[PDB]
Amino acid sequence: TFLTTGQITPEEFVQAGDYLAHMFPTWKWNEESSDISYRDFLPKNKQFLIIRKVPADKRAEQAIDELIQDMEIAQERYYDLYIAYSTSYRVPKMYIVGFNSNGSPLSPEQMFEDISADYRTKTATIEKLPFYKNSVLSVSIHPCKHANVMKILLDKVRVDQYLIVFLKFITSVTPSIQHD
């Protein structure tokens, strides 16, 4: 079915999603909050998976001041990654939100430093996280192709881990962000 097509039903998503969160409890399904723009076809509590503050040690392609003074009494980065389902290309869809070493939000052109060259200039863009109501800027990676892709890597010598394959794909995209 999916290995043939390379795509998943919303019912299969919940399957790989629950599996991924089980084997790497560091990933989580959303909570129900009032700021989430839900989707009828997914359960309220299995809308999108999320991991928080994964360290990025280096950048991708190598892996007021007065006031601040008067009030006195390069570096590491942290990434939140979200995984959502794409309706159009029946496959998973990648969004990332970045923090500098101070815990402040990164600019959309700083996050780009942490996308691999070929993906950066060809298959990536800035985007309101689609599942939050009044919303938050991020870097997304188009599902264009993707499976294609997922259909290639799959064929390696069981649907529950559709997402563990998909994740290793992703690390190719954001190789500076630590992985396991």
């Binding site: 409890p25 560091t26 700021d35 101070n102 815990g103 939000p105 600019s107 939050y132 938050v136």
Partner: protein
């Protein structure tokens, strides 16, 4: 082997954009209040602490204002507040020590009724909601009461099997920061009557620093001492959800004890990366300011051409070109809209007239409501409405037609000087005037001020687009663009009072701007092509047969705008020469030499 216990900062702040977003939304700038106080709630997750961090993330989002909301299993809820200031000055001169001390006293008052509630945090903030600059500082009240009390400690290897029980007990009792052993070595809730006897205290630690507990530790010891002032020696388990839990023999000591009214030693303002006790200031424009978002979206759209298709395309040299548009009619309007699509940022319109009832249908910068108002300034304004970052400006100014008696020397003498000025001031001059008699002077000045000039003229069903300055090519006047033997419709070119087919001006405009961009690209090694294609001297288009011609034309010795004898006469005689040419144009041919060939 005995050390004085030291502590690590309890938390690492992470501010999500939704957090600042939710401040705005609350309309706090619009409120005439000097400062404002709201409760916050974050849910700590002690199982997922980044290797590169030394303590739990304290992650503030919009959801941090909702006070309740859904919480994940074994996530520890932390109650705090944000005091926001409307006046930067009183954010700056706020006594940080005294302020954090007041927050500590609250934790104290709470702590002595329940020891699991002696922990808190505070955010102080000033928001510049227009510059989208946010200043903030996390405070985590950690207190030694009394101040005189410190803790001696030494490793306790012997309490290792406990760590599993404690880790697993804290996960369940997510609202608890402390637990103890009862007389059976079972884990139970803190109770002063029990611990007074069993003397074993476990704390849910928020740091990951090897052998250095969170500074929250002090708050709990302070309560413990108050319940059990006779306590000297006890066991202290620092519990973490990784492999780094540790035990200690702990002893209360005292430095410079006060009489048998306990003061307290407070600390916990968060440091920046540089290691300094100083506020954070943050620019979120790039993430929240819709001007700055759109502006960057335009430049991303353009950069996708360079990256996906033309890698050695120079987008920058385009964006920085100062374009002067002489004419804010059908042509000026369409050219300016092509220029902004290409990311030009400085555009300056020049036009003497006024929006007419017939204009808006043809002239794509004006609406019906605009009729009767001045054209130039309105065009500029129309560009800003489309894209506000635009340095668009209009200048109402007559361009003296050639072969016309002057109506008013001084006002026109002033219009001259002002015309030359704007020309020197810019990089690329588009001539989008209505008749040829209006091209003359601005051709000349633009020659003289060594400027690249793109002419665009229109007939009923045809157009001419052609560049001047910067092999020697010659200008719009070197050669009769159209011959007097040619057809009635070709002859309408650059005639005033010529009704033109609507599509002609759109084609003329697009090709004039594409010609510009191309011209701004580096030429190739011995070719006359750039990364954008050819750069013809002249393009002619005809609608009745949907065709386009490219041609080049040689500079002309007796040309009335270009000739040497004409740059000469201007250079010296300035305005007086120009005046006489405008009124008696046989004079002009007299000088160029054109008279001596006829």
């Amino acid at each position: 082997s005995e050390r004085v216990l030291s502590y690590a900062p309890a938390f690492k702040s992470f501010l999500d954009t939704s957090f600042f977003q939710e401040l705005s939304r609350l309309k706090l700038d619009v409120l005439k209040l000097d400062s404002t106080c709201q409760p916050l709630t974050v849910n700590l997750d002690l199982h997922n602490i980044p290797k590169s961090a030394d303590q739990v993330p304290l992650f503030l989002t919009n959801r941090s204002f909702e006070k309740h909301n859904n919480k994940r299993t074994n996530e520890v809820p932390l109650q705090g507040s944000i005091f926001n200031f409307n006046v930067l000055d009183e954010f700056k001169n706020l006594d940080k020590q005294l302020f954090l001390h007041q927050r500590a006293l609250e934790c104290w008052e709470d702590g002595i009724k329940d020891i699991n509630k002696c922990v808190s945090f505070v955010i102080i903030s000033f928001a510049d909601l227009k510059k989208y600059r946010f200043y903030y500082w996390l405070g985590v009240p950690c207190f030694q009461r009394p101040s005189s009390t410190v803790l001696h400690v030494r490793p306790e290897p012997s309490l290792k099997g406990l760590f599993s029980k404690c880790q697993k007990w804290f996960d369940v009792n997510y609202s608890k920061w402390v637990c103890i052993l009862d007389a059976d070595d079972e884990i139970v809730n803190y109770d002063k009557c029990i611990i007074r006897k069993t003397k074993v205290l476990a704390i849910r630690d928020t740091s990951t620093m090897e052998n250095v507990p969170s500074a929250l530790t002090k708050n709990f010891l302070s309560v413990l001492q108050y319940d059990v002032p006779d306590l000297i020696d006890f066991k202290l388990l620092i519990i973490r959800q990784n492999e780094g839990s540790f035990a200690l023999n702990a002893t209360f000591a005292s430095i410079d004890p006060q009489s048998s009214n306990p003061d307290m030693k407070v600390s916990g303002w968060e440091r920046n990366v540089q290691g300094k006790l100083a506020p954070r200031v943050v620019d979120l424009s790039s993430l929240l300011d819709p001007l700055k978002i759109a502006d960057q979206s335009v430049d991303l759209n353009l950069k996708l051409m360079k990256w996906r298709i033309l890698p050695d395309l120079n987008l920058d040299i385009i964006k920085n070109t100062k374009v002067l548009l002489l004419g804010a009619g059908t042509l000026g309007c369409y050219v300016s809209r092509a220029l902004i699509a290409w990311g030009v940022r400085k555009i300056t319109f020049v036009d003497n007239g006024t929006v007419s009832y017939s204009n808006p249908v043809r002239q794509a910068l004006y609406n019906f409501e605009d009729c009767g108002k001045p054209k130039a300034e309105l065009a500029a304004a129309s560009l800003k409405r489309i894209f506000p970052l635009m340095d668009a400006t209009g200048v109402k100014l007559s361009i003296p037609m050639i072969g016309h008696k002057l109506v008013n020397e001084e006002a026109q003498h002033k219009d001259f000087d002002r015309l030359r000025a704007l020309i020197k001031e810019h990089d690329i001059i588009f001539l989008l005037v209505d008749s040829r008699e209006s091209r003359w002077l601005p051709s000349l000045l633009s020659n003289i001020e060594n400027k690249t000039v793109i002419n665009a003229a229109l007939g009923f069903d045809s157009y001419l687009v052609m560049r001047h300055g910067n092999k020697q090519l010659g200008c719009y006047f070197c050669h009769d663009v159209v011959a007097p033997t040619d057809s009635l419709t070709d002859r309408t070119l650059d005639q005033m009072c010529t009704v033109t087919r609507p599509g002609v001006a759109m084609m003329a405009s697009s090709l004039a701007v594409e010609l510009m961009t191309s011209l701004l690209q580096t030429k190739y090694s011995g070719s006359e092509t750039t990364v954008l294609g050819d750069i013809p001297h002249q393009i002619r288009g005809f609608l009745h047969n949907f065709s386009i011609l490219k041609l080049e034309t040689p500079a002309y010795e007796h040309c009335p705008a270009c000739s040497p004898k004409v740059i000469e006469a201007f250079t010296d005689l300035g305005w007086e020469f120009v005046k006489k040419a405008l009124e008696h144009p046989l004079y002009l041919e007299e000088i160029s030499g054109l008279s001596v060939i006829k």
